[PDB]
Design a protein around this motif. Structure first.
Motif, PDB file in Angstrom:
ATOM      1  N   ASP A 102       0.834  -1.192   0.000  1.00 31.83           N
ATOM      2  CA  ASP A 102       0.000   0.000   0.000  1.00 31.83           C
ATOM      3  C   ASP A 102       0.876   1.252   0.000  1.00 31.83           C
ATOM      4  OD1 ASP A 102      -2.234  -1.675   0.046  1.00 31.83           O
ATOM      5  OD2 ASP A 102      -3.221  -0.584   1.678  1.00 31.83           O
ATOM      6  N   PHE A 103       2.007   1.192   0.705  1.00 33.45           N
ATOM      7  CA  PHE A 103       2.970   2.283   0.685  1.00 33.45           C
ATOM      8  C   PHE A 103       3.480   2.491  -0.734  1.00 33.45           C
ATOM      9  CE2 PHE A 103       7.057   4.366   1.080  1.00 33.45           C
ATOM     10  CZ  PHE A 103       6.795   5.355   2.011  1.00 33.45           C
ATOM     11  N   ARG A 104       3.899   1.402  -1.368  1.00 29.00           N
ATOM     12  CA  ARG A 104       4.364   1.448  -2.747  1.00 29.00           C
ATOM     13  C   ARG A 104       3.321   2.064  -3.687  1.00 29.00           C
ATOM     14  NH1 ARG A 104       7.337  -3.753  -1.408  1.00 29.00           N
ATOM     15  NH2 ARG A 104       5.782  -4.808  -2.724  1.00 29.00           N
ATOM     16  N   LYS A 105       2.040   1.815  -3.409  1.00 25.71           N
ATOM     17  CA  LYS A 105       0.953   2.457  -4.147  1.00 25.71           C
ATOM     18  C   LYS A 105       1.032   3.979  -3.995  1.00 25.71           C
ATOM     19  CE  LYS A 105      -2.599  -1.219  -4.048  1.00 25.71           C
ATOM     20  NZ  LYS A 105      -3.986  -1.570  -3.631  1.00 25.71           N
ATOM     21  N   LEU A 106       1.211   4.446  -2.759  1.00 26.10           N
ATOM     22  CA  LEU A 106       1.312   5.881  -2.488  1.00 26.10           C
ATOM     23  C   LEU A 106       2.479   6.489  -3.240  1.00 26.10           C
ATOM     24  CD1 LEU A 106       0.459   6.606   1.239  1.00 26.10           C
ATOM     25  CD2 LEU A 106      -0.970   6.716  -0.820  1.00 26.10           C
ATOM     26  N   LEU A 107       3.635   5.842  -3.135  1.00 20.27           N
ATOM     27  CA  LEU A 107       4.820   6.273  -3.861  1.00 20.27           C
ATOM     28  C   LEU A 107       4.505   6.425  -5.337  1.00 20.27           C
ATOM     29  CD1 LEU A 107       7.871   4.339  -2.343  1.00 20.27           C
ATOM     30  CD2 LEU A 107       7.140   6.709  -1.996  1.00 20.27           C
ATOM     31  N   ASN A 108       3.814   5.442  -5.903  1.00 19.46           N
ATOM     32  CA  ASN A 108       3.533   5.488  -7.324  1.00 19.46           C
ATOM     33  C   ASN A 108       2.628   6.661  -7.668  1.00 19.46           C
ATOM     34  OD1 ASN A 108       1.920   4.449  -9.969  1.00 19.46           O
ATOM     35  ND2 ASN A 108       4.001   3.608  -9.883  1.00 19.46           N
ATOM     36  N   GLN A 109       1.576   6.864  -6.873  1.00 25.36           N
ATOM     37  CA  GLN A 109       0.680   8.005  -7.065  1.00 25.36           C
ATOM     38  C   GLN A 109       1.436   9.346  -6.943  1.00 25.36           C
ATOM     39  OE1 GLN A 109      -2.222  10.412  -7.901  1.00 25.36           O
ATOM     40  NE2 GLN A 109      -3.181   8.442  -7.411  1.00 25.36           N
ATOM     41  N   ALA A 110       2.401   9.411  -6.025  1.00 21.30           N
ATOM     42  CA  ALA A 110       3.241  10.601  -5.873  1.00 21.30           C
ATOM     43  C   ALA A 110       4.099  10.850  -7.121  1.00 21.30           C
ATOM     44  CB  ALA A 110       4.131  10.476  -4.626  1.00 21.30           C
ATOM     45  N   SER A 111       4.700   9.785  -7.641  1.00 22.98           N
ATOM     46  CA  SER A 111       5.465   9.858  -8.880  1.00 22.98           C
ATOM     47  C   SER A 111       4.601  10.403 -10.004  1.00 22.98           C
ATOM     48  CB  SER A 111       6.014   8.485  -9.260  1.00 22.98           C
ATOM     49  OG  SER A 111       7.397   8.565  -9.557  1.00 22.98           O
TER      50      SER A 111
END
Length: 246
Positions: A102-111
């Motif tokens: 889920d963190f990795r999801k956030l990172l991706n959305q931030a990117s």
């Protein structure tokens, strides 16, 4: 010992707070509010996997369910914790109470968020030539433009009013060992242009005991740190300009 667990990490916590809230007074106030909460009831400090993580966890726990997410969306908070605060993904996940996926999801959305941001025009104020070259190439490789590099105050004043930079990257110290901070503020006057300050010792400007900058990039430079801080600065500036145009 509880103090000895928390004290070392408060300077960088203020950096995160400032990067999340967009100002010193606001960022520092949150951190002070956290201390007030610990003063009220010491047992709110958690047994996280580390003291530093516990400290950031508490910070996010008290102020994010003005909620921190209102000021900076969790996705961008996630990228800041990695790119600026220097946690790894397991650590930042713990801070934000999320499973690594889920963190990795956030990172991706931030990117995604940052890539959609319009590139800006940066003026660099740096007297050390090797440092200035580094930051120039890094800024350009991040997709922004460098309008030029000023070495002296007189150069910067001229460059600023002629090239009209939308963001300034400045060393906290100039040639004569005089203050880069004072110099930038003398130039901008009442102008609301985002400034990010370069220093090798960010902690010295994260005491919260005197006027200190909102954004600090650590030298030696890391591209993701610069990327994150430029992104935050532009976001706050955009939202201020959008709100003033209403």
């Amino acid at each position: 010992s509880l103090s000895t667990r928390i004290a070392p990490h408060l300077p960088y916590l203020r950096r995160f707070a400032r990067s999340v809230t967009g100002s010193q007074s606001s960022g520092d106030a949150y951190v002070s509010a956290m201390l007030e909460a610990l003063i009220a009831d010491i047992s709110i400090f958690p047994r996280a996997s580390s003291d530093r993580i516990g400290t950031y966890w508490l910070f996010c726990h008290l102020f994010d369910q003005a909620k921190l997410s209102y000021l900076t969306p969790r996705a961008r908070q996630a990228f800041l914790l990695i790119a600026v605060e220097g946690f790894n993904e397991q650590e930042a996940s713990e801070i934000m109470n999320l499973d690594a996926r889920d963190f990795r999801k956030l990172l991706n959305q931030a990117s995604i968020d940052i890539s959609q941001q319009i590139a800006t025009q940066v003026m660099i104020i740096e007297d050390e030539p090797l440092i200035a070259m580094d930051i120039e190439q890094m800024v350009e490789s991040l997709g922004h433009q460098v309008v030029g590099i000023a070495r002296t105050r007189k150069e910067a004043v001229v460059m600023y009013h002629q090239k009209k930079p939308r963001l300034i990257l400045a060393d906290i110290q100039l040639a004569d060992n005089s203050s880069g901070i004072d110099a930038v503020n003398d130039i901008l006057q009442n102008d609301r242009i985002p400034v990010i300050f370069i220093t090798a010792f960010p902690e010295r400007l994260l005491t919260g005991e005197r006027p200190e900058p909102t954004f600090l990039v650590t030298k030696p430079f890391n591209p993701d740190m610069v990327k994150a801080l430029i992104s935050q600065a532009l976001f706050f500036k955009e939202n201020a300009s959008k709100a003033a145009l209403e």
